[PDB]
């Protein structure tokens, strides 16, 4: 049986949420934190002119 996924396509409405499908919220969060660190460092480098 070297191909079958054995997925019937059931309907049970108590299936826990998949972290993979949520994940892009975390990818956005991490991209935001990184861009924030960038903006903080460049604003500090500007403020260091004064």
């Amino acid at each position: 049986g070297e191909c079958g996924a054995k997925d019937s396509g059931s309907k049970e409405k108590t299936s826990a949420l998949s972290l993979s499908n949520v994940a892009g919220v975390f990818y956005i969060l991490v991209g935001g934190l990184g861009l924030a660190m960038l903006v903080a460092l460049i604003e500090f480098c500007y403020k260091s002119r004064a």
């Binding site: 972290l19 993979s20 994940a23 892009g24 975390f26 990818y27 991490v30 990184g34 660190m37």
Partner: protein, 192 residues
């Protein structure tokens, strides 16, 4: 916070501890304990499957210690149409983020030693602090791409090397906050 001296000892031992745990987590043969097959074509047996970051092994079957590179080879035509899923697959195949956590935490964990050579410059600590923080951010994205690729339950549990990874995140950013405390002394001496 306690004396400004032991903060340096605590920062350096924290950086050491996090770096040791993350490199071990990167290097360890296993991250989770599960079931399946470590190598086939064993297509008629099942083996408790013992898979790490870049390498994998298996045990308690008919043979033990047949360790191998991680099973994260390409997919059926890689579905470049589903480019976001290929991106996930490629990023977890070109497993940059955990070795980047190593690399960042390496550079920060040494850079903090130049708090005491060329001392009080207080910008060398800032670059260490930034990397201490960025190492944990790089660890968290690394964790999530692992599990997202896993979910790209089958009776499995995460293991010691995985709890070391999470413990490396916890400590690396404690070092990060401790570095900022040492910064907001040494720099306020210049700003008043």
């Amino acid at each position: 916070l306690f004396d400004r001296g032991v903060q340096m000892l605590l920062t350096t031992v924290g950086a050491f501890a996090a770096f040791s745990l993350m490199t071990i987590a990167v290097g360890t043969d296993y991250w989770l304990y599960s079931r399946g097959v470590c190598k086939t074509k064993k297509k008629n047996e099942e083996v408790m499957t013992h898979s790490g970051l870049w390498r994998t092994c298996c045990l308690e079957g008919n043979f033990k210690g047949l360790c191998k590179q991680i099973d994260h080879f390409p997919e059926d035509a890689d579905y470049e149409a589903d480019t976001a899923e290929y991106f996930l697959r490629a990023v977890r195949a070109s497993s940059i983020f955990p070795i980047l956590s190593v690399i960042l935490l390496f550079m920060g964990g040494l850079c903090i030693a130049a708090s005491e050579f060329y001392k009080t410059r207080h910008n060398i600590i800032l670059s260490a602090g930034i990397f201490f923080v960025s190492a944990g951010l790089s660890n968290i994205i690394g964790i999530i791409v692992y599990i997202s690729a896993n979910a790209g339950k089958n009776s499995y549990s995460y293991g010691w090397s995985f709890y070391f990874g999470a413990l490396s995140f916890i400590i690396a950013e404690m070092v990060g906050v401790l570095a900022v405390h040492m910064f907001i002394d040494r720099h306020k001496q210049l700003t008043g």
